[PDB]
Design a binder for these strands. Structure first.
Lengths: 54, 502
DNA sequence: TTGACTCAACATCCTTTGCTACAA
DNA sequence: ATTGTAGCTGGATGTTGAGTCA
């Protein structure tokens, strides 16, 4: 469950700028402690969410 | 400390964060491939690139079926592919250098420091990508992607192939420095993206790298695209080769490219353990937007044979955590070789003349548990069961070990009419398996489930589901809840719901 | 340049129902 | 006072990197 602001970047970076993943993931994962556990058990969720509004 | 750095290992906290980050990063990469694959299918782009391919060449891409020798058709296919490789070199009028390691594997140190500093976010949108491909302006990645887009616009079954390079979570080094010498030239020696094309006549995928190595090949055991040499693999650790198709498929096509999938590469995937196995399978499933074809069957047949032909590895460390094989010497004390079974191979030990080790297939190894151990899976020993092995163990004690077929499923007695459970000497029911729950009762796990039952004065039994180990010493049982007759469940669930009133 | 070693410091797995001393 | 409570697992095996040597 992310802000609309970050999810914009995540989608933009993932689809057209994956060369810039490293710091954005570093940043976002530091600001979203929960994400850690989310990815671990619900990857398909995070996936479909990234493909949503794509 | 200096000793902390001598042995160049990191903390367990780091191990887990690297492991997670690896996964996170991997997902993003794979999703990137999936989205890029979409862009390739772009109809506006398609009709443009289609024009780059002469009628002659188009005809070679769909050769007429040859009865007497299907090979002659494969030949014609390969020819069209080659000519396509050529006019693409011609079309792509500018190649750029990668800006900073492209999508090649970054080191942990590089990632830690990356956050720290700003960079110029040269934004790429979907349109930009199309315009780039049609003008022939871009780095080697965009190039092959455009090439794929061209082949698809000639109605050939062309895959985008992406070798995902997340950081190595198997890398436990605190210092992750790299050799600066010839660093670029060695990184670009092998591509990250390439192409696979389906040969219907021979029923195999053809491997096509039109941009980097500029070759077309029919991988059998070796691939020219699997990076080789310590130097190169510093930025190109091959472990997730993913294939995306026209119809929005997504297949883990690594097996093709990894000479040593099972020994060498397994060790390097998030897939080494069983949790990661399922985890990855989920990511694939989430990217696979088509139903299975006969082609999927053909490729699986190929992969199946590739596993068969890899065979016993050449080196001891490679037979460490192997999915199919174990060294005689690595058979755990709690294991025996299934009756009438030998080794299935041998291993020439590198370093000592004529030194050889017996190798067993994991499937010929049987796991034994003790009387107690089995009971922790709701299992008791059969009437006429003799044990298979004996071990000395301290609390020195000869503990006997039994095979699965010596064991019987433990069925506990039914609860009485009043719902009276028959319990142990401590006044509880041991419940370590769904099997251990009486067949007319239910397990209700709740911190207050015990309190609730007592309040309703109804007949129950506390559930010992596991044991907690600790304190100065000794063990204490974890009572996680209640076993009660099924017909009292909703009564209990109600009480539980209103505990604050009890 | 190769892996099989041994070393040394961790990590992870298997265990699977308290006991004594003392302050109140 | 004779109860309520604070304070006393772990050993065998597996994994990781360095360093050395044939």
């Amino acid at each position: 469950g992310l802000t609309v602001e970050d999810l914009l970047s995540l989608r933009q970076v993932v689809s057209g700028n994956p060369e810039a993943l490293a710091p954005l993931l570093e940043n976002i994962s530091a600001r979203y402690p929960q994400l850690r556990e989310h990815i671990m058990a619900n990857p398909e969720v995070f996936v479909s969410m990234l493909l949503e509004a794509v | 400390d200096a000793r902390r750095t001598s042995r160049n290992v990191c903390s367990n906290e780091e191990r887990k964060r690297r492991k997670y980050f690896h996964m996170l990063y991997l997902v993003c990469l794979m999703v990137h491939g999936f989205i890029r694959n979409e862009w390739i299918n772009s109809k506006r782009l398609s009709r443009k690139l289609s024009n780059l391919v002469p009628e002659k060449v188009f005809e070679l891409l769909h050769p007429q079926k040859d009865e007497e020798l299907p090979l002659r058709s494969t030949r014609k296919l390969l020819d069209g592919l080659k000519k396509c490789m050529e006019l693409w070199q011609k079309h792509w009028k500018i190649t750029k250098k990668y800006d900073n390691e492209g999508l090649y594997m970054r080191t942990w140190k590089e990632i830690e420091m990356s956050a720290n500093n700003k960079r110029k976010f040269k934004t790429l949108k979907r349109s930009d990508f199309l315009r780039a491909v049609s003008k022939g302006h871009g780095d080697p990645d965009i190039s092959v992607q455009g090439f794929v887009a061209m082949l698809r616009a000639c109605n050939v079954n062309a895959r985008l192939i992406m070798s995902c390079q997340p950081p190595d979570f198997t890398n436990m080094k605190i210092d992750t420095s790299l050799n600066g010498n010839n660093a670029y030239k060695d990184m670009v020696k092998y591509p990250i993206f390439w192409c696979e094309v389906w040969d219907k006549f021979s029923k195999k995928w053809i491997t096509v790298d039109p941009v980097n190595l500029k070759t077309i090949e029919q991988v059998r055991l070796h691939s020219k695209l699997a990076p080789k040499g310590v130097a190169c693999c510093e930025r190109n650790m091959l472990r997730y080769v993913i294939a995306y198709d026209r119809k929005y498929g997504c297949r883990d096509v690594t097996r093709r490219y990894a000479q040593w999938m099972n020994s060498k590469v397994r060790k390097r995937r998030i897939t080494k353990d069983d949790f990661g196995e399922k985890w990855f399978r989920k990511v694939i499933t989430a990217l696979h937007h088509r139903k299975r074809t006969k082609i999927d069957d053909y490729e699986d047949q190929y992969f199946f044979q590739r596993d068969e032909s890899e065979g016993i590895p050449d080196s001891v460390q490679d037979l460490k955590n192997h999915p199919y094989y174990v060294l005689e010497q690595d058979i755990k004390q709690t294991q025996i070789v299934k009756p009438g079974c030998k080794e299935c191979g041998y291993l020439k030990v590198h370093g000592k003349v004529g030194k050889v080790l017996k190798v067993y297939a994991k499937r010929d190894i049987a796991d034994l548990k003790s009387a107690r151990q089995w009971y922790m899976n709701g299992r008791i020993l059969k009437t006429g069961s003799r044990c298979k092995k004996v071990i000395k163990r301290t609390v020195e004690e000869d503990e006997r070990l039994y095979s699965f077929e010596d064991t019987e499923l433990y069925i506990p007695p039914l609860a009485s009419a009043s719902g009276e459970i028959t319990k142990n000497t401590f006044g509880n029911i041991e419940v370590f398996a769904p099997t251990m729950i009486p067949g007319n009762c239910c397990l209700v796990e709740n911190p207050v489930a015990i309190k609730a039952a007592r309040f309703l004065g109804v007949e129950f039994a506390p559930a010992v589901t596991s044991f907690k180990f600790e304190r100065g010493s000794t063990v204490k049982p974890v009572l996680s809840g209640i076993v009660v007759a099924k017909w009292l469940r909703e009564a209990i669930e109600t009480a539980i719901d209103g505990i604050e009133f009890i």
